[PDB]
Design a protein around this ligand. Sequence first.
Ligand SMILES: C[As](C)(=O)[O-]
Lengths: 129, 132
Amino acid sequence: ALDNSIRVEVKTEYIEQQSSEKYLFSYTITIINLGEQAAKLETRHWIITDANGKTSEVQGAGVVGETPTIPPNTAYQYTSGTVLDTPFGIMYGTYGMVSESGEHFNAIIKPFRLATPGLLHLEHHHHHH
Amino acid sequence: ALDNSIRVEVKTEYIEQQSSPEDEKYLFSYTITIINLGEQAAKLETRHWIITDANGKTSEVQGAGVVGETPTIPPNTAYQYTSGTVLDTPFGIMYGTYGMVSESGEHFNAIIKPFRLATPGLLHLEHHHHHH
Ligand SMILES: C[As](C)(=O)[O-]
């Protein structure tokens, strides 16, 4: 029931540039419950930040319109997206969970990158001879 | 000439609400199918969208290709792709054109008929029944 009983994994994908400039990204999240009892995702709380420092927040019921119940040792996956004003940004937040025993807690979704394949930062190394 | 060689079909889906305390936002996805019924390959070079919210407030999107590519659709082939858009109202309309170019080098447009974007059950269901 305690925190850490829920692990959040994330993958993203730059979808398309909407020049009017805006950038559409998609993100697929897998919420895995490794706790003793089942847990229900009741709310979400996103904090999005673009390359310019402009930040926005989204608080709502469930994810993609659903409040799934994730039994123990089960993984719930879903996909959504966000439109940024810049070709890259950072996104993090929390999910409002509720244990089978009626105990409410937050599942943490660590910061993750939103970026076009051309602006994804790469550190460069090489062989020393 | 080749204006009839391409047919566009589309389906949509309400993904998720992206609203902030005072700024309504609704994320939609759309899956376009571009069928080349021509006897020659056709390459999608540009797109030009006209997006309208429930109040007539429109936005215009113009760019090269779709989702990062300018696909070549050979004869008798249906190319599908998915993208999306965010509206400030739970209902809206989209329409526009794709700038196509044929193997022969000729440029023409593939029309994209207007289609809706709507959150499910925005309008209550109407009921019919076998009379008598
Ligand atoms: C599934 As999407 C992020 O292209 O609306």
